[PDB]
Structures are given as C-alpha cells and as structure tokens.
Amino acid sequence: AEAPEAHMPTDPGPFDCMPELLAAARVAPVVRIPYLGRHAWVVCDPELVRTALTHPLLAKDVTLVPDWMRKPGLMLGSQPDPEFARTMIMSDGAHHARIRRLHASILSPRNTERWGERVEAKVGGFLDELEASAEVNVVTAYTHRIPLAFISEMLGLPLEAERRLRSITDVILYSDDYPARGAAVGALYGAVESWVRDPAPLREGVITDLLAPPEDQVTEGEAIVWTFAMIITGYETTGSLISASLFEALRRPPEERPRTDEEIKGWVEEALRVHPPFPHPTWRFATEDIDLGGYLIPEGAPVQVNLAAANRGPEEGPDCFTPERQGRGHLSFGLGMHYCIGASLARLEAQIALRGFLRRFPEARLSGVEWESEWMIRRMIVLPAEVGLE
Numbered sequence: 001a002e003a004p005e006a007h008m009p010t011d012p013g014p015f016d017c018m019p020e021l022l023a024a025a026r027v028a029p030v031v032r033i034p035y036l037g038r039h040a041w042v043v044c045d046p047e048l049v050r051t052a053l054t055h056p057l058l059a060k061d062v063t064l065v066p067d068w069m070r071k072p073g074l075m076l077g078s079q080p081d082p083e084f085a086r087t088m089i090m091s092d093g094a095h096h097a098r099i100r101r102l103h104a105s106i107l108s109p110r111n112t113e114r115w116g117e118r119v120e121a122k123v124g125g126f127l128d129e130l131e132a133s134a135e136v137n138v139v140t141a142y143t144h145r146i147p148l149a150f151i152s153e154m155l156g157l158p159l160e161a162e163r164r165l166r167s168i169t170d171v172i173l174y175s176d177d178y179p180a181r182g183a184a185v186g187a188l189y190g191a192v193e194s195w196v197r198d199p200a201p202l203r204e205g206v207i208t209d210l211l212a213p214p215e216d217q218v219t220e221g222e223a224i225v226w227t228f229a230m231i232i233t234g235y236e237t238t239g240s241l242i243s244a245s246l247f248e249a250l251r252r253p254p255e256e257r258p259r260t261d262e263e264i265k266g267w268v269e270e271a272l273r274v275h276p277p278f279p280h281p282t283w284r285f286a287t288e289d290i291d292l293g294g295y296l297i298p299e300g301a302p303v304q305v306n307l308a309a310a311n312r313g314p315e316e317g318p319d320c321f322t323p324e325r326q327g328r329g330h331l332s333f334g335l336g337m338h339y340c341i342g343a344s345l346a347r348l349e350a351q352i353a354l355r356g357f358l359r360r361f362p363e364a365r366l367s368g369v370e371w372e373s374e375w376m377i378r379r380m381i382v383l384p385a386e387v388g389l390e
C-alpha cells in the first residue's frame with residue numbers, strides 16, 4: 001500500500017505549527033508530504049515510530065541522501081566528505097560506534113555533581129542579572145543565556161565569541177532565507193577550523209582535549225566536524241526545553257507548580273513529551289523496501305518520524321501538559337543507536353534552571369507568547385512574564 005499525502009509547514013516562521021503536525025498524523029500511520037519539490041515519507045503512528053527509529057534498514061549515512069535534498073543551508077547539503085569525517089548522527093554501524101566511543105572518553109572523570117554545581121553557579125548569575133532590571137521576556141533573559149554559557153565553557157570557546165554565536169545558529173536553524181543559511185553554516189565551519197588549527201585563542205576544555213595525545217586518535221578533520229556538531233546541538237534545544245518547562249509553570253497558579261526534586265524531574269519530562277524541541281528528528285533512508293504498517297516505503301526513500309505525534313495518543317491534542325503523566329513514554333531524545341548523547345546534560349540543566357527560577361520568583365505569572373517553529377524544530381522566542389519579587 002502507498003502512503004497518502006498530507007501537508008506540514010516545511011519552512012520556519014513566526015507561528016506554532018503544532019496543530020498542523022498533529023493533523024497530518026490523523027491522515028494515516030505513514031504519510032507523504034511535499035518537500036523541496038519532491039516528497040518525503042513520515043511515520044506518525046507511535047509504535048510504528050518506535051520501530052522506525054530502530055529499523056536495521058533505515059540508515060543515516062550521507063552517501064544515501066539524493067541530490068535534490070542537498071541544498072546549501074540545509075543539514076543534508078552541509079555535510080563534509082564522509083571519507084574525511086562524518087558527523088555522529090549521520091554515520092552507521094561501526095563508524096557510529098567509534099565516533100560515539102571517542103566522544104565518551106572526553107572529560108574523564110565526568111562527575112555530574114560537578115557539572116551540576118557549575119550549572120547552578122551560572123543559573124544564579126543570570127538570575128541576578130535578571131533581578132538587576134515591568135514585563136520580562138524570560139526567553140531572551142534566562143532560557144537562552146544558560147545553555148549557551150555552559151556549552152561555551154565546556155567546549156572552551158573564547159568568551160568573545162559567545163555573544164556572536166547565538167546570532168549565527170539562529171540563522172542556521174530558524175531563518176527562511178537559503179542564502180543566509182548557507183552563509184551562516186559556512187561562517188561556523190570557517191571559524192571552527194581556525195580555532196582547531198590554531199588553538200591559541202581557546203580556553204582549556206573539550207576542544208583542546210581532542211587535539212591532545214594510539215587507537216583513540218582523533219583526526220584534525222574529525223575534531224572540526226564534531227565540534228561543529230556540538231555547537232549546533234549543544235544549547236539551542238536545551239533552552240527550548242527550559243522555556244517550555246517555565247511556560248507550563250508560569251501559566252498555572254503557584255500552588256500547582258513543582259517544588260520537590262521529583263516533581264521538577266517529572267515536570268521537565270512532561271515538557272519534553274508535550275513540547276519536543278525536535279518535532280521531527282534527523283533523516284533516515286531505506287536501504288531496502290520496507291513495510292511498516294502495511295504501507296510501502298520504497299528504497300532510498302527519505303523518511304522522518306513524527307515525535308510530537310508519537311508522544312501523544314489519539315486523544316491529547318497540541319496543548320496536553322499533564323503533571324501526572326511525568327512524560328512517561330516520550331521519544332524526544334530518540335531511541336536506540338542514535339539516542340541523544342547529551343540527554344543527561346540537557347535534563348540536568350533544565351532541572352536546575354527551572355528550579356532556580358521558581359525558588360527565586362515564587363509569585364511569577366504570565367499575564368503574548370510567540371513561537372517560532374517548522375515541522376523539524378520548535379521554539380518559544382518570547383515568554384512574557386511578570387517576575388514579582390524574590
């Protein structure tokens with residue numbers, strides 16, 4: 001059986017595309033959407049999504065992407081030569097295992113109480129910078145600054161570049177102009193290469209550790225590609241999870257807000273389920289013809305999965321935050337081989353940032369909220385609040 005045709009917003013703009021994406025999951029478990037003049041398959045039924053994420057015949061190597069998707073400014077049209085270096089999310093099999101293993105030998109000994117106390121020290125400083133200022137946009141004043149400040153110190157980037165990097169990735173991930181996206185992607189690659197080949201303006205951190213001393217040798221090219229990947233993924237979605245968690249707390253009476261360590265952990269989990277920063281993740285390609293739920297996915301087919309629809313049943317709807325659910329059964333970090341490597345980091349930062357704000361402004365309220373989203377990324381750009389007093 002062939003998958004029927006539905007419609008998702010493919011270009012980013014100032015709207016919340018959530019009702020359009022959940023409406024396309026109602027078409028069929030597998031659907032075909034118009035994308036870049038051709039079509040793309042998407043899995044929408046939750047269990048069918050969970051099997052697609054693990055499918056042995058759905059690969060992600062850059063040798064499989066057809067030419068009509070390799071457009072400059074987009075991820076698939078921005079990869080390097082796979083023989084020189086591959087990014088972790090776009091490798092398969094033993095290639096992926098080596099890249100993932102080398103990334104996990106970084107920063108030994110990794111103690112999360114150390115990671116967290118530094119997350120806490122930065123959350124306090126931005127809460128103070130906030131208190132040093134009646135409506136407040138907590139997105140631009142809090143949720144944006146925290147994950148950026150940590151990943152820069154963790155990577156060891158020079159403090160001068162931190163103010164400029166937010167504006168570069170903003171274009172790569174949310175602009176609707178392809179030339180601007182092609183320029184911002186090249187600007188990041190050219191800056192990363194300058195830092196790796198000449199590590200003088202860098203602080204000791206992750207990057208200098210990859211350029212250090214048998215079988216765990218990281219080439220200069222892999223150091224650049226992996227650093228680029230970690231700048232693209234290292235803070236943007238973490239800030240979207242922080243703001244999304246705060247939105248659901250600020251909109252409720254202070255009594256219904258989490259206070260315990262357990263309720264804060266369950267709160268950030270339910271925010272991941274309801275507001276996936278990646279409503280659809282990265283691309284996969286059928287190495288053989290596949291049937292999923294009676295629907296055909298032909299060979300070489302580009303396939304995506306509806307994480308926003310897999311996180312909900314047929315009953316929920318776009319606004320379905322339930323503190324009792326605690327995000328049980330969400331697929332927002334992926335599953336299996338390519339499960340998010342920075343999931344523990346994004347959780348601990350979301351948990352610390354959400355608790356830090358609620359302990360500092362116990363009488364905060366929302367009192368509008370604007371989104372920026374496409375079918376593959378979703379974020380709040382203002383969350384206007386009224387903070388009250390400490």
Ligand code: HEM
Binds near residue numbers: 340
């Ligand atoms: C809450 C924020 C985050 C979300 C929602 C998120 C989501 C995801 C998802 C869905 C994937 C899998 C994509 C797929 O299978 O198609 C993924 C993979 C990945 N994420 Fe995250 N992520 C987050 C935070 C981070 C952070 C902070 C880092 C880096 C520190 C990071 C680095 C990665 C990497 C490297 C991969 C690729 C893993 C692999 O293929 O082996 N992510 N992320």
Ligand SMILES: C[C@@H]1O[C@@H](n2c3ccccc3c3c4c(c5c6ccccc6[nH]c5c32)CNC4=O)C[C@@H](N)[C@H]1O
Binds near residue numbers: 072077078079080081
């Ligand atoms: C990932 C890509 O990197 C950019 N790129 C340059 C950007 C600026 C200057 C030179 C290149 C350059 C070169 C080459 C490749 C290449 C070979 C195989 C597969 C992908 C490749 N990409 C190459 C590439 C080979 N010899 C070169 O000089 C283009 C951009 N469309 C983006 O898709």
Ligand SMILES: C[C@@H]1O[C@@H](n2c3ccccc3c3c4c(c5c6ccccc6[nH]c5c32)CNC4=O)C[C@@H](N)[C@H]1O
Binds near residue numbers: 282
């Ligand atoms: C707008 C969002 O980001 C876009 N994106 C690029 C857009 C342009 C150039 C490079 C990338 C790029 C890269 C990577 C990821 C990635 C890794 C894990 C999970 C999600 C990810 N998204 C990545 C990504 C890793 N290394 C990269 O170069 C793709 C788009 N589908 C959407 O996810």
